[PDB]
């Protein structure tokens, strides 16, 4: 076929029930994740090809960057709770991988302050039990698919994108092939 299991995607040996429709995992320590966000705009181009009625989910993972990695997962929980993903994603990535000015929880916090989230509101979110289960949700989803690498996308808890099997000579072509794959798996 044109789309083959083990080519543009793999099938999960152990499908996950009730999983989000389009589930994406990343880490601010993850170099391909940086690319996926700032150079390729993967999430955005996938979205632009998904049908009416599709929710798109993105979670942070713990297994990179040790202690700071966990802080970043809590921070992404804060971002999701406050709805400020689109204001902190870029400065978190660049603070970690480009300028390397993020070294502690306080530096993560500064990124939010500079993005215009008030201290009082950030600290309250940070310590809230609405952020705790949001952290729990992130961890659960990763655990359910036995996740050991990012970037990763899973469709309807059963299919996992395999970007290793797409041409990379051209960035633009890579992205569309990726997004078309998601769409195909979506319709499956």
PDB file of C-alpha atoms in Angstrom:
ATOM      1  CA  UNK A   1       0.000   0.000   0.000  1.00  0.00           C
ATOM      2  CA  UNK A   2       1.004   3.668  -0.020  1.00  0.00           C
ATOM      3  CA  UNK A   3       0.709   3.848   3.774  1.00  0.00           C
ATOM      4  CA  UNK A   4       2.235   0.767   5.454  1.00  0.00           C
ATOM      5  CA  UNK A   5       2.372  -0.342   9.067  1.00  0.00           C
ATOM      6  CA  UNK A   6       6.027  -0.114  10.017  1.00  0.00           C
ATOM      7  CA  UNK A   7       6.660   2.585   7.372  1.00  0.00           C
ATOM      8  CA  UNK A   8       5.072   6.011   8.089  1.00  0.00           C
ATOM      9  CA  UNK A   9       3.594   4.651  11.261  1.00  0.00           C
ATOM     10  CA  UNK A  10       3.671   1.693  13.632  1.00  0.00           C
ATOM     11  CA  UNK A  11       0.750  -0.011  15.352  1.00  0.00           C
ATOM     12  CA  UNK A  12       0.613  -0.360  19.105  1.00  0.00           C
ATOM     13  CA  UNK A  13       0.866  -3.931  20.290  1.00  0.00           C
ATOM     14  CA  UNK A  14      -1.219  -2.741  23.210  1.00  0.00           C
ATOM     15  CA  UNK A  15      -3.838  -0.178  22.063  1.00  0.00           C
ATOM     16  CA  UNK A  16      -4.983   2.422  24.583  1.00  0.00           C
ATOM     17  CA  UNK A  17      -8.662   3.003  25.313  1.00  0.00           C
ATOM     18  CA  UNK A  18     -10.133   6.469  25.813  1.00  0.00           C
ATOM     19  CA  UNK A  19      -6.860   7.968  24.601  1.00  0.00           C
ATOM     20  CA  UNK A  20      -6.931  11.444  23.091  1.00  0.00           C
ATOM     21  CA  UNK A  21      -7.568  11.638  19.319  1.00  0.00           C
ATOM     22  CA  UNK A  22      -4.255  13.265  18.466  1.00  0.00           C
ATOM     23  CA  UNK A  23      -1.742  12.961  21.295  1.00  0.00           C
ATOM     24  CA  UNK A  24       1.644  14.628  21.024  1.00  0.00           C
ATOM     25  CA  UNK A  25       4.626  14.291  23.430  1.00  0.00           C
ATOM     26  CA  UNK A  26       7.641  16.572  23.681  1.00  0.00           C
ATOM     27  CA  UNK A  27      10.370  17.871  25.994  1.00  0.00           C
ATOM     28  CA  UNK A  28      11.921  21.339  26.103  1.00  0.00           C
ATOM     29  CA  UNK A  29      15.265  19.450  26.281  1.00  0.00           C
ATOM     30  CA  UNK A  30      14.469  17.552  23.065  1.00  0.00           C
ATOM     31  CA  UNK A  31      16.337  18.912  19.999  1.00  0.00           C
ATOM     32  CA  UNK A  32      14.029  17.445  17.347  1.00  0.00           C
ATOM     33  CA  UNK A  33      11.198  18.876  19.478  1.00  0.00           C
ATOM     34  CA  UNK A  34      12.738  22.300  19.136  1.00  0.00           C
ATOM     35  CA  UNK A  35      12.822  21.817  15.362  1.00  0.00           C
ATOM     36  CA  UNK A  36       9.231  20.481  15.421  1.00  0.00           C
ATOM     37  CA  UNK A  37       8.141  23.676  17.133  1.00  0.00           C
ATOM     38  CA  UNK A  38      10.162  26.535  15.600  1.00  0.00           C
ATOM     39  CA  UNK A  39      11.330  25.348  12.173  1.00  0.00           C
ATOM     40  CA  UNK A  40       8.676  22.823  11.052  1.00  0.00           C
ATOM     41  CA  UNK A  41       5.598  23.985  12.990  1.00  0.00           C
ATOM     42  CA  UNK A  42       4.350  20.366  13.019  1.00  0.00           C
ATOM     43  CA  UNK A  43       1.472  20.776  15.448  1.00  0.00           C
ATOM     44  CA  UNK A  44       0.159  23.667  13.489  1.00  0.00           C
ATOM     45  CA  UNK A  45       0.347  21.997  10.073  1.00  0.00           C
ATOM     46  CA  UNK A  46      -1.213  18.811  11.413  1.00  0.00           C
ATOM     47  CA  UNK A  47      -4.112  20.829  12.843  1.00  0.00           C
ATOM     48  CA  UNK A  48      -4.661  22.558   9.473  1.00  0.00           C
ATOM     49  CA  UNK A  49      -5.300  19.140   7.882  1.00  0.00           C
ATOM     50  CA  UNK A  50      -7.420  17.584  10.612  1.00  0.00           C
ATOM     51  CA  UNK A  51     -11.227  17.361  10.135  1.00  0.00           C
ATOM     52  CA  UNK A  52     -13.937  19.247  11.918  1.00  0.00           C
ATOM     53  CA  UNK A  53     -14.398  17.709  15.370  1.00  0.00           C
ATOM     54  CA  UNK A  54     -10.808  16.850  16.288  1.00  0.00           C
ATOM     55  CA  UNK A  55      -9.163  17.864  19.573  1.00  0.00           C
ATOM     56  CA  UNK A  56      -5.384  18.078  19.659  1.00  0.00           C
ATOM     57  CA  UNK A  57      -3.407  17.289  22.817  1.00  0.00           C
ATOM     58  CA  UNK A  58       0.237  18.005  23.704  1.00  0.00           C
ATOM     59  CA  UNK A  59       2.048  16.836  26.851  1.00  0.00           C
ATOM     60  CA  UNK A  60       5.506  17.336  28.351  1.00  0.00           C
ATOM     61  CA  UNK A  61       7.611  14.376  29.547  1.00  0.00           C
ATOM     62  CA  UNK A  62       9.811  13.739  32.594  1.00  0.00           C
ATOM     63  CA  UNK A  63      12.556  11.508  31.229  1.00  0.00           C
ATOM     64  CA  UNK A  64      14.848  14.284  29.928  1.00  0.00           C
ATOM     65  CA  UNK A  65      16.776  16.867  31.917  1.00  0.00           C
ATOM     66  CA  UNK A  66      16.298  15.276  35.321  1.00  0.00           C
ATOM     67  CA  UNK A  67      14.997  17.630  38.002  1.00  0.00           C
ATOM     68  CA  UNK A  68      14.456  20.502  35.628  1.00  0.00           C
ATOM     69  CA  UNK A  69      12.605  18.127  33.331  1.00  0.00           C
ATOM     70  CA  UNK A  70      10.002  17.523  36.042  1.00  0.00           C
ATOM     71  CA  UNK A  71       9.806  21.235  36.751  1.00  0.00           C
ATOM     72  CA  UNK A  72       9.096  21.776  33.068  1.00  0.00           C
ATOM     73  CA  UNK A  73       6.300  19.210  33.161  1.00  0.00           C
ATOM     74  CA  UNK A  74       4.723  21.016  36.123  1.00  0.00           C
ATOM     75  CA  UNK A  75       5.248  24.302  34.213  1.00  0.00           C
ATOM     76  CA  UNK A  76       3.529  22.981  31.116  1.00  0.00           C
ATOM     77  CA  UNK A  77       0.666  21.910  33.401  1.00  0.00           C
ATOM     78  CA  UNK A  78       0.529  25.549  34.530  1.00  0.00           C
ATOM     79  CA  UNK A  79       0.570  26.705  30.935  1.00  0.00           C
ATOM     80  CA  UNK A  80      -2.319  24.352  30.030  1.00  0.00           C
ATOM     81  CA  UNK A  81      -4.376  25.337  33.080  1.00  0.00           C
ATOM     82  CA  UNK A  82      -3.951  29.061  32.303  1.00  0.00           C
ATOM     83  CA  UNK A  83      -4.270  28.613  28.574  1.00  0.00           C
ATOM     84  CA  UNK A  84      -0.950  30.287  27.877  1.00  0.00           C
ATOM     85  CA  UNK A  85       0.804  27.563  25.854  1.00  0.00           C
ATOM     86  CA  UNK A  86       1.284  29.841  22.896  1.00  0.00           C
ATOM     87  CA  UNK A  87       3.071  32.506  24.910  1.00  0.00           C
ATOM     88  CA  UNK A  88       5.599  30.356  26.693  1.00  0.00           C
ATOM     89  CA  UNK A  89       6.429  27.590  24.266  1.00  0.00           C
ATOM     90  CA  UNK A  90       9.001  29.519  22.263  1.00  0.00           C
ATOM     91  CA  UNK A  91      10.772  31.246  25.196  1.00  0.00           C
ATOM     92  CA  UNK A  92      10.928  27.960  27.126  1.00  0.00           C
ATOM     93  CA  UNK A  93      12.556  26.200  24.190  1.00  0.00           C
ATOM     94  CA  UNK A  94      15.069  28.998  23.622  1.00  0.00           C
ATOM     95  CA  UNK A  95      15.722  29.446  27.331  1.00  0.00           C
ATOM     96  CA  UNK A  96      16.624  25.765  27.554  1.00  0.00           C
ATOM     97  CA  UNK A  97      18.342  25.025  24.207  1.00  0.00           C
ATOM     98  CA  UNK A  98      19.410  28.345  22.677  1.00  0.00           C
ATOM     99  CA  UNK A  99      20.422  30.842  25.371  1.00  0.00           C
ATOM    100  CA  UNK A 100      20.630  28.286  28.201  1.00  0.00           C
ATOM    101  CA  UNK A 101      19.249  30.780  30.680  1.00  0.00           C
ATOM    102  CA  UNK A 102      16.856  28.291  32.224  1.00  0.00           C
ATOM    103  CA  UNK A 103      18.524  26.413  35.015  1.00  0.00           C
ATOM    104  CA  UNK A 104      16.025  26.357  37.844  1.00  0.00           C
ATOM    105  CA  UNK A 105      12.335  26.600  38.601  1.00  0.00           C
ATOM    106  CA  UNK A 106      12.810  30.321  39.226  1.00  0.00           C
ATOM    107  CA  UNK A 107      14.130  30.828  35.683  1.00  0.00           C
ATOM    108  CA  UNK A 108      11.143  28.916  34.245  1.00  0.00           C
ATOM    109  CA  UNK A 109       8.948  31.226  36.273  1.00  0.00           C
ATOM    110  CA  UNK A 110      10.650  34.366  34.835  1.00  0.00           C
ATOM    111  CA  UNK A 111       9.720  33.217  31.338  1.00  0.00           C
ATOM    112  CA  UNK A 112       6.047  33.282  32.388  1.00  0.00           C
ATOM    113  CA  UNK A 113       6.454  36.714  34.096  1.00  0.00           C
ATOM    114  CA  UNK A 114       8.050  38.158  30.979  1.00  0.00           C
ATOM    115  CA  UNK A 115       5.171  36.689  28.971  1.00  0.00           C
ATOM    116  CA  UNK A 116       2.819  38.726  31.128  1.00  0.00           C
ATOM    117  CA  UNK A 117       1.398  36.105  33.481  1.00  0.00           C
ATOM    118  CA  UNK A 118       1.261  37.637  36.944  1.00  0.00           C
ATOM    119  CA  UNK A 119       3.444  36.174  39.682  1.00  0.00           C
ATOM    120  CA  UNK A 120       0.530  35.763  42.025  1.00  0.00           C
ATOM    121  CA  UNK A 121      -1.374  33.895  39.329  1.00  0.00           C
ATOM    122  CA  UNK A 122       1.597  31.682  38.333  1.00  0.00           C
ATOM    123  CA  UNK A 123       2.505  30.685  41.877  1.00  0.00           C
ATOM    124  CA  UNK A 124      -1.134  29.876  42.676  1.00  0.00           C
ATOM    125  CA  UNK A 125      -1.433  27.736  39.540  1.00  0.00           C
ATOM    126  CA  UNK A 126       1.941  26.050  40.304  1.00  0.00           C
ATOM    127  CA  UNK A 127       0.757  24.961  43.760  1.00  0.00           C
ATOM    128  CA  UNK A 128      -2.813  24.072  42.773  1.00  0.00           C
ATOM    129  CA  UNK A 129      -4.276  20.569  42.809  1.00  0.00           C
ATOM    130  CA  UNK A 130      -5.760  21.354  39.381  1.00  0.00           C
ATOM    131  CA  UNK A 131      -2.144  21.488  38.183  1.00  0.00           C
ATOM    132  CA  UNK A 132      -1.280  18.288  40.151  1.00  0.00           C
ATOM    133  CA  UNK A 133      -3.753  16.047  38.244  1.00  0.00           C
ATOM    134  CA  UNK A 134      -2.767  17.827  35.034  1.00  0.00           C
ATOM    135  CA  UNK A 135       0.772  16.633  35.851  1.00  0.00           C
ATOM    136  CA  UNK A 136      -0.726  13.202  36.681  1.00  0.00           C
ATOM    137  CA  UNK A 137      -2.573  13.203  33.356  1.00  0.00           C
ATOM    138  CA  UNK A 138       0.652  13.931  31.466  1.00  0.00           C
ATOM    139  CA  UNK A 139       2.491  11.164  33.205  1.00  0.00           C
ATOM    140  CA  UNK A 140      -0.351   8.664  32.771  1.00  0.00           C
ATOM    141  CA  UNK A 141      -0.586   9.191  29.028  1.00  0.00           C
ATOM    142  CA  UNK A 142       3.165   8.708  28.585  1.00  0.00           C
ATOM    143  CA  UNK A 143       3.083   5.589  30.802  1.00  0.00           C
ATOM    144  CA  UNK A 144       0.196   4.031  28.862  1.00  0.00           C
ATOM    145  CA  UNK A 145       2.301   3.840  25.669  1.00  0.00           C
ATOM    146  CA  UNK A 146       5.570   3.040  27.433  1.00  0.00           C
ATOM    147  CA  UNK A 147       7.102   6.185  26.039  1.00  0.00           C
ATOM    148  CA  UNK A 148      10.902   6.332  25.859  1.00  0.00           C
ATOM    149  CA  UNK A 149      11.387   8.863  23.081  1.00  0.00           C
ATOM    150  CA  UNK A 150      10.182  12.268  21.920  1.00  0.00           C
ATOM    151  CA  UNK A 151       8.981  13.868  19.709  1.00  0.00           C
ATOM    152  CA  UNK A 152       6.099  11.404  19.493  1.00  0.00           C
ATOM    153  CA  UNK A 153       2.561  11.516  18.166  1.00  0.00           C
ATOM    154  CA  UNK A 154      -0.096   8.869  18.732  1.00  0.00           C
ATOM    155  CA  UNK A 155      -3.440   8.786  16.872  1.00  0.00           C
ATOM    156  CA  UNK A 156      -6.568   7.456  18.652  1.00  0.00           C
ATOM    157  CA  UNK A 157      -4.404   5.548  21.102  1.00  0.00           C
ATOM    158  CA  UNK A 158      -3.493   2.964  18.497  1.00  0.00           C
ATOM    159  CA  UNK A 159      -1.066   4.405  15.915  1.00  0.00           C
ATOM    160  CA  UNK A 160       2.333   6.008  16.355  1.00  0.00           C
ATOM    161  CA  UNK A 161       3.851   8.272  13.724  1.00  0.00           C
ATOM    162  CA  UNK A 162       7.172   7.104  12.327  1.00  0.00           C
ATOM    163  CA  UNK A 163       8.976  10.220  11.005  1.00  0.00           C
ATOM    164  CA  UNK A 164      12.130   8.157  10.473  1.00  0.00           C
ATOM    165  CA  UNK A 165      10.310   6.700   7.445  1.00  0.00           C
ATOM    166  CA  UNK A 166       9.713   9.983   5.558  1.00  0.00           C
ATOM    167  CA  UNK A 167      12.091  11.927   3.201  1.00  0.00           C
ATOM    168  CA  UNK A 168      14.027  14.768   4.897  1.00  0.00           C
ATOM    169  CA  UNK A 169      15.808  16.357   1.889  1.00  0.00           C
ATOM    170  CA  UNK A 170      13.019  18.926   1.990  1.00  0.00           C
ATOM    171  CA  UNK A 171      11.566  20.291   5.226  1.00  0.00           C
ATOM    172  CA  UNK A 172       8.263  21.434   3.645  1.00  0.00           C
ATOM    173  CA  UNK A 173       7.716  18.059   2.023  1.00  0.00           C
ATOM    174  CA  UNK A 174       8.512  16.327   5.315  1.00  0.00           C
ATOM    175  CA  UNK A 175       5.860  18.293   7.186  1.00  0.00           C
ATOM    176  CA  UNK A 176       3.073  17.620   4.672  1.00  0.00           C
ATOM    177  CA  UNK A 177       3.919  13.946   4.520  1.00  0.00           C
ATOM    178  CA  UNK A 178       3.784  13.926   8.289  1.00  0.00           C
ATOM    179  CA  UNK A 179       0.476  15.801   8.461  1.00  0.00           C
ATOM    180  CA  UNK A 180      -1.104  13.749   5.630  1.00  0.00           C
ATOM    181  CA  UNK A 181      -0.120  10.645   7.571  1.00  0.00           C
ATOM    182  CA  UNK A 182      -1.865  11.892  10.668  1.00  0.00           C
ATOM    183  CA  UNK A 183      -4.972  12.651   8.565  1.00  0.00           C
ATOM    184  CA  UNK A 184      -4.926   9.172   7.009  1.00  0.00           C
ATOM    185  CA  UNK A 185      -4.578   7.539  10.436  1.00  0.00           C
ATOM    186  CA  UNK A 186      -7.296   9.828  11.716  1.00  0.00           C
ATOM    187  CA  UNK A 187      -9.727   8.519   9.081  1.00  0.00           C
ATOM    188  CA  UNK A 188      -8.703   4.912   9.733  1.00  0.00           C
TER     189      UNK A 188
END
